Write a structure and sequence with these properties.
Chain lengths: 239, 238
Amino acid sequence: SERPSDLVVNRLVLFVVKGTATSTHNTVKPLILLEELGVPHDIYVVEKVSAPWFSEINPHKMVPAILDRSPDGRDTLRAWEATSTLMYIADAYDKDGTFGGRNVQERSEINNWLTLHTAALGPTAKYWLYFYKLHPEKLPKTIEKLRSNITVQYDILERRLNEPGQQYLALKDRPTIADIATLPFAMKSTAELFGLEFEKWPKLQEWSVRMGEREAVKRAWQRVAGFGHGEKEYGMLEA
Amino acid sequence: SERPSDLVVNRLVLFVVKGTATSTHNTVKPLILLEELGVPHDIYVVEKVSAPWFSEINPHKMVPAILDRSPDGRDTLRAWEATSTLMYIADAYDKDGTFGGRNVQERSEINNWLTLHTAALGPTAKYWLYFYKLHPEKLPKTIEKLRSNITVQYDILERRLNEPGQQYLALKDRPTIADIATLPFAMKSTAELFGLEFEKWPKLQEWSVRMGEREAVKRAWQRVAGFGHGEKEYGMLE
C-alpha cells in the first residue's frame, strides 16, 4: 500500500477518475466550490479506486476524496464522501460563510437541504445507476421503484422553489453547498438519463439553469469531463 | 396550515412518534446529543406525520424534526433529517465542540464518518427495511444485495476501530455526532434484525457496548421507548 511516486500534498489534492457522463456527478461537487472560492488545488486521476494505497485515503474506495495540509501546515488531513468534501472546503477556505452559512439561522437551512440530498436523492440516484448498469442481473421492478423515489425528491425540491422569493434551496439570496450538492442530480441531462421529463418540475428546471450560468459551475463541468483524457492519463495532473 | 393549540416554541421542541421497536432508531440520535449536552427541550408526539401542519416543519414528512428559537430570538429555526438535527444542536448548543469538533482537523474526520452513515449505511439500512417489510412485493435478490452492502459497511467500521488507539469512529479520545449517528444501525439488536452475527465484528461490538454504557445514551433509549405511552398519548408532553 505504498503511495505512487507523484502523490505529494503541497496544497489541496482532489482525487477524481477518468471523465465520463456517469463518473463526474460527485467529483464535480467539491470542484464547483474550489472554483467558486478560487482555492489553489491539484487534481489526481486515480486509475483503480480498489488500489490499497487509495483505501488508506478513503476506506469507502470512491472519488471524490481530498488530501490537504492542516491549517498550521505541519500535518495532513483527509475528506471523503462528496458532502464531506464540501463541508471540509467550506470549513478550511470559506471564512466569510458565503457558501457554508454566516450564522446559526443560515446553517440550519443549508444543513437541512444538504442532508436531504446526502440521505435521499444522492443514495437513491446511486442505487438506480448501480442496478441500471453495474449489477450483473437486470432487476427492473427495483430500478422502477428507485426511479419513482427520484420523482418524489424532485417534487420536494419543486415545492421549496415555489415558495415566495426562494431563488435557491437553502437561502433566498444566494447559492450554498446545499445547491452545489443537489445540482448534478437535478439538471435536464441527468433527468433524461433517469428517463424523466424535467419540464414537469418548472421551478426546479429554472433553478438548474440559474446554477448552470455561474462561471465557477461552467469551469467545473468543463474540467471534470477532461480529467484522464489529456497528455497524462493517470496520476498527478501538471499544474 | 394552522398548528395544534398545544404546539408552542419556548425552547427546542423535538418531534417524535409513539415509541415502538421500529420507530426510534432515527429520533434517538438528536435525543442522545440533547442528553449529552444537557440542552433544555420539549417532546412533541406527532399522531400523523402526513398532517399538513407537520409538512410545513419537515417537507420530507418524517421524525425526527426540531423547532427552536434563533439565538437572537428574531426567527423560528427548523432542523429535519436525523443528521441535520445533530448538526443543528451542535451548532446552537455545543459551544466547546465536544461532539462537533474543536478544530478543522477534528471536524474533517467527524464529517467523514458522519457523512459515511448519512450516505451509505443509513440509506442502505432504510432500503433493506423498506424492501424486507414495506414493499407490496418481496424482491429477495434486491434484499440480499442490500444485506451484502450492510456487511461491507460493518467491515469498514471494523477496519477503523482496529487502528491503534481508535476507541471511537472519528476521534481516538471521545465520541462525536459521527458515533451518535452510527450507533442505532451498528448494535447487536439491529445486526440481528438484518440476520447478521454481530460477534463477527468484535471491535465494532466492543464500541457499541462502550457507547451503550454512556448515561446519556441509556437515558435517550429509555425516554424514546416511553414517548406516547405516559399520561399523554399525542401532542406536547409535560
